[PDB]
Amino acid sequence: ETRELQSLAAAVVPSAQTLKITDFSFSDFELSDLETALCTIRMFTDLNLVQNFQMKHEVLCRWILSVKKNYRKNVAYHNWRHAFNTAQCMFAALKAGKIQNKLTDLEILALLIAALSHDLDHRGVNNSYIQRSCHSIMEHHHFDQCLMILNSPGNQILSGLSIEEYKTTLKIIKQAILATDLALYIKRRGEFFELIRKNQFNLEDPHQKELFLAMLMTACDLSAITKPWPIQQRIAELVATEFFDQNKIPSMQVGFIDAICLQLYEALTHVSEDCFPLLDGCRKNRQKWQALAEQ
Ligand SMILES: COc1ccc(CNc2nc(N(CCO)CCO)nc3c2[nH]c(=O)n3C(C)C)cc1
Ligand SMILES: [Mg+2]
Ligand SMILES: [Zn+2]
DSSP states (O other): OOOHHHHHHTSOOOOOHHHHHTTOOOOTTTOOHHHHHHHHHHHHHTTTTHTTTTTHHHHHHHHHHHHTTSSTTTSSSSSSSHHHHHHHHHHHHHHOOOGGSSSHHHHHHHHHHHHHHHTTTEEEEEEHHHOOOOHHHHHHHHHHHHHHHTTTTOTTTTTSHHHHHHHHHHHHHHHHHHHHHHHHHHHHHHHHHHHHHTOOTTSHHHHHHHHHHHHHHHHTTTTGGGSHHHHHHHHHHHHHHHHTOOOOHHHHHHHHHIIIIHHHHHHHHHHHHHGGHHHHHHHHHHHHHHHHOOO
8 A cells, every 4th residue: 555545544534514515616726635535535425325335445545546646637627636626516416406316326326436537547638649549539538547447456446336236337437428528418418408498308218317417427527617706717727728838718718608508507407406506607707708808
């Protein structure tokens, strides 16, 4: 064992209220790497995943450290912090958004794992090493890294599942990670929006449920656009660093919000009214970006 593992396994995990992971406005700027690992343990714990699937504490701790280690720190935005924030928004949407009651335990377990793993080994939007070595090539690589870690010795947090549970969970994880491809979201959101605008959305149908899981993953993947203005400004700076280094930014932000985010969080609010803080935060950021664009 390394020094990081023994220090994390021996630490006391604060409650979800103390860690503020239940709030949609949560931010990680003030947290250290160890602190995000403890927040991740609390997410598994408070979703009853450690109990319902007999996860050993040292296995979950090693799995979290494996996931974090397989994100690249040199990447300005697509790193562990982005994955950690995607999972936190998933936790908040399940808890504060009351989506947890609409899903099964296996679905929740898969969503949390997928949210943390959905961008593993990302190299930046401008690096083509993965693609050089139908166009969901990056997301297939991310799931491949996720499956590799889940099968590594000491990291098998799904060992407590039966083959039927294990294969069902693996299938949901794969679909959830593949759903984080924006091309897939654009191709499929039309059916989701058409169902919602006719009061025809029903979660009991297996096809609509899998579509809801895909939209939920995108909503968490993009959730930085919903954060309080000081936080959203900071993350937008990280994104601009990845897009460029590795004056039209305000107008591009408004276009991104209009074309992608606004309708998604509106539809999510229709499924669960308690997810309104995400839609509200997205509207407030459109205000601040539009005012900067008019300047
Ligand atoms: C070079 O500077 C820029 C900066 C931003 C833009 C357009 N805005 C975007 N903003 C975000 N996020 C909002 C925070 O700001 C982060 C996630 O929510 N993601 C984006 C874009 N575009 C994209 O494809 N993505 C994907 C990575 C989803 C264009 C040029
Ligand atoms: Mg991704
Ligand atoms: Zn992502």
